Design a protein around this nucleic acid. Structure first.
Ligand SMILES: [Mg+2]
Ligand SMILES: [Mg+2]
Ligand SMILES: [Mg+2]
Ligand SMILES: [Mg+2]
Ligand SMILES: [Mg+2]
Ligand SMILES: [Mg+2]
Ligand SMILES: [Mg+2]
Ligand SMILES: [Mg+2]
Ligand SMILES: [Mg+2]
Ligand SMILES: [Mg+2]
Ligand SMILES: [Mg+2]
Ligand SMILES: [Mg+2]
Ligand SMILES: [Mg+2]
Ligand SMILES: [Zn+2]
Ligand SMILES: [Zn+2]
Ligand SMILES: [Zn+2]
Lengths: 55, 116, 89, 180, 199, 87, 190, 58, 194, 238, 355
RNA sequence: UAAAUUAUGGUCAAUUGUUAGUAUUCAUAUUAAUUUUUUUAAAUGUUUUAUCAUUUUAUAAAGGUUUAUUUUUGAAAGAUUUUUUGUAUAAAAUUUUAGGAAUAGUUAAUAAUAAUUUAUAAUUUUGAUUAGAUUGUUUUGUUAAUGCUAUUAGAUGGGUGUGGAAAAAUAAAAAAAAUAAUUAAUAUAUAUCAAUAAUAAAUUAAAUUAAUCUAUUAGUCAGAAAUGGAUGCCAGCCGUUGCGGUAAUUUCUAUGCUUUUAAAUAU
């Protein structure tokens, strides 16, 4: 591992590689991989009545 | 970290090959097509008149080199390398040699002076 | 280039080129002669052009239809193989 | 058609022009230098590969001793050798069908090979260029001219179709009894 | 063997034949041209030719797509290539069959020249090489007195480990003195002394 | 290998610097003495950086610019660069 | 000659026998990152660049390369790659325009495994058959508008539930409950 | 399996040229070579993939 | 089975041999004379044109043989002095002969056409060739000359002096003194003859 | 300048160059002395010819090398004057003794290099004795008349027309070549009759003649008069 | 590839080792054997044994192979638009590739090339090639076209049969027309009162139900335009009487009275007692629908002051050769076609007399 | 759910660091490079023509682009006596930053419409747009090896729009409409980024044409190789454990001695 890529440590390289790993990729189940925590508890106090046009 | 330089110096023997030193059958190309020199015309009587009528370009100042040739045969006996020995600059000596071989082909150095 | 000799018709002009290509009749005759000689060369040259053209066309016929022979046999074989695999299917 | 012409490497017509067979190699010390016979366009770009139609061959302009063949007391074979690789199917295609152009040096080569007659620029300065007058030429022509049909058929065989069918292969190709 | 397998010694070859010349319309004016200093070999290349896999099929005189060679002799004629000259245009082939007599093998003691064998120049004298453990050498022409069936081939197909090996490394890092096992050599002295040597 | 010690070589093996100060610093125990440290300057992309390096060199008649090379570690903590020659 | 050692070299101009004529590009350069910004203020909202950035595409490790072999090429013989696509219709807000979500394939040779990515297309349905949630076949064609190169070739599966849902005057599909994520906290009560 | 087989500059390691003909027709590239913008950086893509791997047909 | 497309007619070509054609012959393309030794070519060219054709190979072979009998007649008595500092060496003839024999028998140069010419080209006095070499072995054994290089004892100090083709003196090597006759070299000559 | 550094061309004849420090150094460590065993003059029983080929005047002048100091194997390059053709050259004794190397002209002395004496051609003194007088006179003209009439020897002749001296080949002068060698130019005999400078005028006579006759010149003329039973193949034209 | 300092194309085919002069190992005089093996020859990696590329490295089985047997069937499909473009291109190339530069044989070349490129040579191409070749007076190559079509198992339509029978008659070979007849046109009928006159096009053209699309193998879904599929619908206009006429001409040309009498009698009878079939409109592909142009900018008739220049707007020169002033043969009534048929037979009598 | 043989076939995968309790790809090794050396480049005036004009001569200036760059024959090739055709500008894949939020002359339909046509529009968390860095999809190095690690360079908007095609304002090494020339590859002293020269680095001599060059380093505790003399926690050594406290085989100096001989050292 060339030392100039990513951080000054080695493990930073493998931490950004986990971003490209095949079986780790973003889909309908696993979402917002890179910032999970900025979006957390965001809608707790947002009250949305669900959509029903059928009785 | 590699400060030490190469591990070995690989060198091969020189051992002369009896097969590569074997006599080579030779021909001289002057035998196949004989060389000759065209005698001067009334148009071009001297080597200096020649260098005068081959002078066209501003940068091919042929006429300035008249002294570096002793006679007629001296001119047509010159080739480019030996023509460099005598200290003629580059594109000038190409103009000269071109002119000479052209005269040899049956085309005399008749061309309009472009300097003006 | 087009050679412009010194005995071509001199144009007296200060606004343009000093020498117009216009020929002494001698120059015209001369030019005609030289050009006849090179005509002699290019006759054989283009003769060889079209000769090689038909050579290449003919070889293309023969090899290409040999190719079509072998190839058609191949694709006939493949097609047979397939409809068989589908009967089995 | 460039406003400020590229002065050093002019050509004729627009680029890319008709394909021309050239000899070219990178310049180096004379001891190692080779050339490439290449069909390419008239206007080259920086790297010669951009317009390159076909690669005709390598030509090495160094007379060589033949160490591949056994040393042969025959006089002529022990002259030095000059090695060249010609691709002649592509050559005959390009030259013949596509109607190429030719620089002079490749022409000299392919003349040596027997693909082309010697070039226009190869001059024994011994002989002059010939003279001509039409009445003498006419006397020679009236003296020898072949028959019209003979000539027409020769032009037929050289230019148009060569391979023809003798009556025999006709008779051998025409259907037999059940469909005859 | 000779009686039972007559076809194992080739007695036949494709004859060297002269090609007909193409007519030059320019006549004598150009006749000087194709007559020159040297021989000119021309081997064909293309999509159908030059592939080692197919080599024999391409040198086969029966095949009509056979690769074409030609040679201009210095007098201007043209002839077909001798079989040697044909084979010159393929990557070099090594034939040695070990099954009856030993083929001569490269990188031996009497084979390898000095600088590869030892890192020093060693004089080649035909008498008494102590390094090569020979007493004397009479030096006849190699394949002359020996029987021809005995000559088998040569084998270069291995690494010459005294000389050059793969993945070269220091055998021992300390002390600083040892190198890879290919560097064997005597010590060079403090500055050289030259004794005049007619003696 | 420690790649962050080389920060001011900026991917180069050697550097050119100008002399400014020369002061003395005491090494990490149990090594006592005075280690001579030269405080140098150089510029890259029109930024002027102050480099701080170990003076092992030989000073003759008064001179200005040195040649900086990176080493292994030395007695003195915090000083990565060493001096090759003085010009 | 790339197979010869450092010391074994004589001429640099030619290959004597054969092999590959190779230019050595110097791979180890110790290239470095210049730091022009304070860690506090970096002039981008979403991302920050603190180190040497790997560059190229396909020169990018770990390599991710186009995979021709997937469902779409499995079913179709395509004259040109991407000339056929099977997908679902997502939304019709535009007249004679069906948006279509489609999957394609990427291969990681390092790990020897495939991933499915997804991409949206604008397809041209004249006559407006496609209801959101249709399974459609889609083809490459004439340039139609700025972004539409694709047209709806065939409906594989129509949406029967969605069509009957429309017939009753209701939207084809209920509108998604939440939109895109935010970095704020919205306090909205009653 | 070794380094020499990494170098595709040999013609023995590289899928041959003619494949691209077999897919797009013979003498098809001579057209492409005369194109206005060529080889800076890009040329009309040259498809050479061993014919048993073709996604289209197989 | 019968769903999806009709069965391509060309399939028939598999089961029916009637449809396997080649419209043209092998060389009808203009290459017919490629095979120099085919009966077709012998019929087209006729015999005297084939003679004209192979004359060059015939004179190749005759050239080899002529060189060989020149060298034999020159060096036949093995020991003499034929030139200024140069004297006869059987070894010359030997090595040439080996060049010849390699032209024929080797698998690197394999020029075998040379051997098709022997029934004609080959000189009647050279038929016995190894016999002539044995005679040379008998002449090689003279006492005034060194048993190894065959240079004269009186006028020469070393093996290989003033010989162009000598094996015994190599480039940076050393000179070897003349070796003397005795049972060693006697049975060397003997084993060679054998 | 820069280009001074370029290695010269080494043609096929020449062995090892010694142009590099590595190639020079090990021979720089060889120091020769002339003893009684090394001295050329002791060995005249063998090398007598080699002794009588040395330039005794010129070597001691230019090289400061006495003739008693010259080893039979001597590596130094000294001046020679060929006792056959009489031309001067500079070589080392070692190379003339170890193999035969000597004046470069007498390399081409025989009609073909490949086969040295194999010629069956008569000498010049016989076939064309009228040539022997045109040789520039160095006193060696009796040795040069001894050569083959087919010989490729490069000799100098005094031109008939201008009385000056030029250099051509014996076989080029006679016109005759040996069977199996390369044919020369058909006109070579007429063209080498004179100087390269004096040759043009005489050979332009028949051309002016042929344009005087017919008012038209084509080089064709010779081949035409060559025209005023040939086996030929069956053709596929039909 | 070429001309660069690092140029690989020049090294990619085999060459004998070059020693002209000193290449750094002093190659002019030096025996390079070990230098050859350990240095000059490419190796697998630095220090490994030399990698041998020679003929002995490959197996024997490369030379056991017949030609072109390494090829596999290639299904290449392409857009419908592109099929039209390509078929047109091949058509106009078969007509003529170059202006005076076209050899007759070139039509044959282009048909063959069309096959080599994995296209199906449709009926238009065959008719065009045959008419071109025959009009160049080259009759063997015409039959060669036919044999190509037979080898591709393409069922000739009625039009194609006509063309090939024209080639047969002009060649005067009856034995061709007989096999052609026997194989293809046998069941060819005439048109009667109960017949329906020009038959509608009945073909579906080819589609896929979603189950056909998904569940079938790759080849069953592969549609290349194949001549055989519409052969029925090329024949929908009943050109039969032409075939019978041509066949009469052949049987006459080959000098056989009974067979000729047969065909000509069948034809005569049908022409008298059966309805006249509806003629087919002009084929879009063989002859092109005239496109609208203004004729305004044109060299005037008198444009050159020295002569009469013919012009695109009108012909001032006059007809060079007399034309018969009759519509194309298919537009005739049945009685008219009877007359035409007799004049045709006479013409063949004349031609045979001249041969 | 059975073995197999008419016997080595279808052509070579093979890994070398003297460490310091133990856990963890991390100093000192080899190969490849930068450190390092003037044996391959080059000078200005492009050229015809019908005369103040008109024909020929189309991708190396910079800027920094990651959903990005895409095209014809009407020029030339090119062959007939004149009207000659159709196919093109579109797309699909692969796209970087440790810690991540909104973007915008804006989508789609109409049409040779609309600076105010119609509409429930378009891009984004499957990571957008700005912003940093960066010349994109046959080129390298290491390696037994899925890897890791390189690859230059070249397409920067419009504004009388010429031309077949804008590629159009020094910087060739492309013969440019009569064979300028091919006995030519040599170009003197300049440059840019390349292009690996310590080429038998030491004893028998160069089948020459004798031309360029006069050519050296390191260690000396551990681990090949030591003694005097100073110095005294100082001066200094330091790849690393560590050394220096009047006896230092570890500093400095002198002399010897050691090396497996394209150098040490730095990155
Ligand atoms: Mg290094
Ligand atoms: Mg760093
Ligand atoms: Mg420390
Ligand atoms: Mg690798
Ligand atoms: Mg630019
Ligand atoms: Mg940016
Ligand atoms: Mg894309
Ligand atoms: Mg696009
Ligand atoms: Mg502007
Ligand atoms: Mg020790
Ligand atoms: Mg120290
Ligand atoms: Mg003290
Ligand atoms: Mg001490
Ligand atoms: Zn002896
Ligand atoms: Zn002499
Ligand atoms: Zn004279």
């Amino acid at each position: 591992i060339a030392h100039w890529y990513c951080g000054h440590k080695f493990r930073h390289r493998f931490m950004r590689d986990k971003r490209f790993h095949p079986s780790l990729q973003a889909s309908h189940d696993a979402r917002n991989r890179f910032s999970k925590r900025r979006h957390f508890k965001t809608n707790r106090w947002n009250y949305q009545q669900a959509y029903r046009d059928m009785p | 970290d590699q400060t030490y330089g190469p591990h070995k110096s690989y060198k091969y023997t020189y051992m002369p090959d009896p097969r590569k030193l074997a006599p080579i059958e030779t021909t001289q190309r002057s035998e196949i097509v004989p060389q000759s020199i065209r005698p001067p015309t009334s148009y071009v009587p001297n080597h200096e008149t020649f260098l005068e009528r081959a002078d066209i370009h501003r940068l091919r100042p042929t006429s300035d080199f008249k002294a570096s040739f002793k006679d007629w045969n001296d001119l047509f006996t010159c080739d480019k390398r030996q023509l460099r020995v005598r200290g003629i600059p580059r594109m000038t000596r190409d103009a000269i040699r071109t002119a000479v071989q052209a005269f040899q082909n049956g085309n005399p150095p008749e061309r309009f002076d472009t300097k003006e | 280039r087009q050679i412009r000799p010194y005995y071509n018709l001199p144009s007296k002009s200060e606004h343009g080129r000093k020498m117009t290509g216009f020929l002494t009749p001698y120059r015209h005759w001369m030019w005609k002669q030289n050009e006849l000689w090179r005509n002699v060369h290019e006759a054989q040259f283009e003769h060889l052009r079209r000769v090689y053209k038909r050579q290449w066309l003919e070889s293309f016929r023969v090899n290409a239809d040999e190719y079509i022979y072998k190839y058609n046999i191949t694709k006939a074989a493949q097609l047979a193989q397939w409809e068989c695999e589908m009967k089995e299917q | 058609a460039r406003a400020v012409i590229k002065r050093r490497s002019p050509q004729l017509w627009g680029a890319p022009g008709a394909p021309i067979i050239r000899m070219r190699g990178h310049h180096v010390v004379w001891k190692f230098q080779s050339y490439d016979l290449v069909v390419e366009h008239t206007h080259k770009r920086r790297n010669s590969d951009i317009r390159l139609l076909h690669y005709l061959g390598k030509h090495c302009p160094h007379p060589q001793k033949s160490l591949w063949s056994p040393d042969t007391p025959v006089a002529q074979d022990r002259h030095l050798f000059m090695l060249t690789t010609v691709d002649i199917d592509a050559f005959k295609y390009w030259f013949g069908v596509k109607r190429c152009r030719l620089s002079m040096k490749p022409w000299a080569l392919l003349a040596k090979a027997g693909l082309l007659p010697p070039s226009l620029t190869q001059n024994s300065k011994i002989m002059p260029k010939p003279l001509f007058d039409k009445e003498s030429l006419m006397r020679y022509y009236l003296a020898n001219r072949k028959d019209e049909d003979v000539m027409a058929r020769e032009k037929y065989l050289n230019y148009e179709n060569s391979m023809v069918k003798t009556e025999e292969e006709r008779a051998a190709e025409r259907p037999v009894a059940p469909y005859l | 063997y000779r009686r039972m397998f007559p076809e194992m010694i080739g007695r036949t070859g494709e004859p060297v034949q002269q090609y007909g010349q193409m007519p030059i319309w320019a006549g004598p004016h150009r006749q000087h041209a194709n007559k020159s200093e040297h021989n000119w070999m021309f081997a064909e290349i293309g999509v159908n030719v030059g592939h080692e896999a197919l080599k024999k099929l391409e040198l086969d005189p029966t095949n009509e797509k056979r690769r074409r060679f030609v040679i201009r002799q210095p007098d201007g004629t043209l002839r077909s290539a001798k079989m040697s000259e044909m084979r010159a245009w393929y990557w070099k082939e090594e034939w040695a069959d070990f099954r009856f007599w030993a083929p001569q093998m490269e990188w031996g003691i009497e084979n390898t020249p000095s600088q590869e064998q030892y890192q020093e120049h060693v004089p080649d004298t035909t008498d008494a090489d102590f390094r090569k453990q020979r007493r004397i050498q009479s030096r006849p022409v190699k394949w002359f007195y020996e029987s021809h069936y005995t000559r088998t081939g040569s084998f270069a197909g291995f690494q010459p480990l005294r000389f050059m090996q793969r993945r070269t490394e220091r055998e021992v890092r300390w002390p600083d003195v040892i190198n890879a096992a290919v560097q064997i050599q005597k010590r060079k002295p403090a500055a050289y002394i030259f004794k005049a040597i007619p003696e | 290998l420690f790649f962050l010690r080389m920060w001011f070589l900026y991917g180069c093996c050697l550097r050119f610097v100008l002399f400014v100060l020369c002061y003395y610093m005491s090494p990490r125990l149990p090594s006592s003495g005075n280690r001579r440290v030269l405080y140098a300057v150089f510029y890259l992309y029109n930024f002027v950086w102050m480099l701080r390096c170990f003076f092992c060199c030989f000073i003759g008649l008064v001179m200005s610019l040195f040649i900086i090379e990176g080493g292994g570690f030395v007695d003195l903590p915090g000083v990565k660069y060493y001096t090759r020659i003085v010009s | 000659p790339w197979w010869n050692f450092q010391t074994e070299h004589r001429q640099r101009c030619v290959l004597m026998y054969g092999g590959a004529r190779t230019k050595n590009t110097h791979n180890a350069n110790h290239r470095v990152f210049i730091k022009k910004y304070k860690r506090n203020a970096f002039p981008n909202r979403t991302r920050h660049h603190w180190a040497v950035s790997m560059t190229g595409v396909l020169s990018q490790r770990p390599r991710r390369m186009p995979w021709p072999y997937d469902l779409t090429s499995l079913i179709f013989n395509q004259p040109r790659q991407g000339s056929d696509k099977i997908g679902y219709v997502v939304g019709t807000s535009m007249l004679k325009t069906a948006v279509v979500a489609t999957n394609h394939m990427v291969y990681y040779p390092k790990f020897n495994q495939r991933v499915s990515r997804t991409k949206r297309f604008f397809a041209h349905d004249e006559d407006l058959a496609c209801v959101e949630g249709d399974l459609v076949h889609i083809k490459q064609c004439r340039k139609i508008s700025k972004y539409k190169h694709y047209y709806v070739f065939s409906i594989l599966e129509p949406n029967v539930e969605g069509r009957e849902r429309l017939k009753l005057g209701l939207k084809a599909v209920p509108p998604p409950l939440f939109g895109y994520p935010v970095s704020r906290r919205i306090v909205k009560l009653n | 399996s070794f380094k020499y087989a990494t170098k595709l500059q040999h013609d023995e390691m590289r899928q041959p040229y003619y494949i691209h003909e077999k897919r797009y027709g013979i003498f098809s590239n001579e057209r492409n070579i005369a194109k206005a913008r060529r080889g800076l950086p890009f040329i009309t893509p040259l498809y050479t993939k061993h014919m048993n791997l073709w996604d289209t047909d197989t | 089975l019968y769903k999806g497309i009709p069965r391509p007619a060309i399939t028939n070509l598999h089961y029916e041999p009637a449809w396997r054609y080649t419209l043209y012959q092998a060389g009808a393309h203009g290459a017919q004379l490629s095979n120099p030794r085919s009966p077709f070519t012998a019929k087209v060219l006729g015999d005297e044109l084939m003679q004209v054709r192979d004359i060059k190979s015939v004179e190749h072979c005759k050239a080899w043989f002529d060189r060989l009998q020149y060298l034999i007649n020159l060096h036949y008595e093995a020991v003499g002095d034929i030139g200024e500092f140069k004297s006869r060496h059987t070894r010359h003839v030997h090595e040439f002969f080996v060049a010849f024999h390699d032209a024929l028998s080797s698998l690197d140069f394999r020029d075998t056409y040379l051997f098709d010419q022997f029934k004609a080209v080959r000189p009647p006095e050279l038929s016995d060739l190894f016999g002539i070499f044995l005679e040379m072995e008998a002449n090689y054994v003279h006492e005034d000359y060194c048993p190894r290089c065959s240079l004269p004892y009186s006028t020469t100090r070393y093996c290989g002096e003033g010989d162009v083709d000598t094996p015994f003196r190599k480039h940076r090597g050393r000179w070897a003194p003349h070796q003397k006759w005795g049972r060693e070299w006697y049975d060397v000559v003997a084993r060679r003859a054998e | 300048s820069r280009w001074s550094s370029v290695w010269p061309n080494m043609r096929y004849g020449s062995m090892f160059l010694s142009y590099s420090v590595g190639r020079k150094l090990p021979m720089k460590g060889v120091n020769w002395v002339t003893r009684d065993s090394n001295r050329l003059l002791n060995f005249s029983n063998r090398y007598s010819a080699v002794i009588s080929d040395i330039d005794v005047k010129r070597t001691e002048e230019e090289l400061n090398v006495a003739l008693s100091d010259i080893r039979w194997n001597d590596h130094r390059r000294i001046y020679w004057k060929c006792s056959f053709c009489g031309s001067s050259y500079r070589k080392n004794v070692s190379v003339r003794t170890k193999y035969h190397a000597g004046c470069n002209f007498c390399k081409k002395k025989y009609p073909s290099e490949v086969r040295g004496e194999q010629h069956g051609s008569p000498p010049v003194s016989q076939a064309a004795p009228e040539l022997t007088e045109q040789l520039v006179d160095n006193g060696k003209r009796d040795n040069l008349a001894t050569l083959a009439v087919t010989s490729k020897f490069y000799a100098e002749w005094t031109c008939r027309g201008c009385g000056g001296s030029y250099r051509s080949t014996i076989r080029s002068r006679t016109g005759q070549v040996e069977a199996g060698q390369c044919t020369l130019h058909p006109d070579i005999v007429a063209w080498s009759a004179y100087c390269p400078s004096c040759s043009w005028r005489p050979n332009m006579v028949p051309i002016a003649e042929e344009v005087s006759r017919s008012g038209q010149f084509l080089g064709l003329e010779r081949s035409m008069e060559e025209l005023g039973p040939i086996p030929r193949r069956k053709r596929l034209a039909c | 590839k070429v001309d660069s300092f690092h140029a690989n194309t020049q090294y990619q085919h085999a060459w004998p080792l070059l020693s002209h002069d000193d290449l750094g190992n002093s190659d002019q005089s030096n025996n390079t054997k070990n230098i050859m093996y350990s240095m000059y020859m490419p190796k697998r990696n630095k220090g490994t044994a030399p990698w041998f590329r020679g003929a002995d490295t490959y197996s024997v089985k490369y030379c056991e192979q017949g030609r072109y047997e390494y090829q596999r069937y290639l299904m290449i499909n392409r857009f419908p638009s592109e099929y039209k473009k390509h078929f047109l291109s091949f058509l106009s190339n078969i007509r003529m590739s170059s202006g005076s530069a076209t050899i007759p044989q070139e039509a044959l070349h282009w048909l063959l090339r069309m096959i080599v490129d994995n296209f199906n040579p449709q009926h238009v191409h065959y008719i065009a090639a045959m008419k071109t070749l025959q009009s160049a007076g080259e009759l063997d190559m015409a039959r060669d076209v036919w044999k190509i079509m037979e080898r591709q198992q393409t069922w000739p339509c009625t039009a194609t049969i006509c063309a090939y029978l024209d080639v047969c008659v002009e060649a005067g070979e009856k034995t061709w027309a007989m096999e052609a007849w026997n194989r293809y046109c046998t069941e060819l009928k005439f048109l009667e009162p109960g017949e329906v006159d020009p038959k509608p096009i009945s073909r579906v053209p080819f589609s896929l139900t979603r189950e056909e699309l998904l569940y079938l193998p790759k080849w069953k879904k592969h549609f290349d335009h194949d001549p055989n599929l519409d052969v029925m619908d090329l024949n929908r206009f009943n050109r039969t009487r032409e075939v019978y006429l041509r066949m009469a001409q052949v049987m006459l040309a080959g000098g056989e009275r009974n067979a000729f009498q047969h065909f000509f009698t069948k034809l005569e009878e049908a022409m008298l007692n059966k309805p006249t079939p509806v003629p087919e409109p002009p084929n879009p592909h063989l002859v092109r629908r005239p496109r609208w142009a203004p004729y305004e900018h044109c060299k005037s008739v008198h444009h050159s002051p020295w002569r009469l220049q013919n012009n695109g707007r009108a012909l001032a020169l006059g007809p060079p050769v007399t034309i018969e002033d009759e519509m194309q043969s298919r537009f005739f009534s049945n009685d008219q076609f009877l007359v035409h048929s007799v004049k045709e037979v006479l013409r063949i009598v004349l031609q045979e007399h001249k041969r």
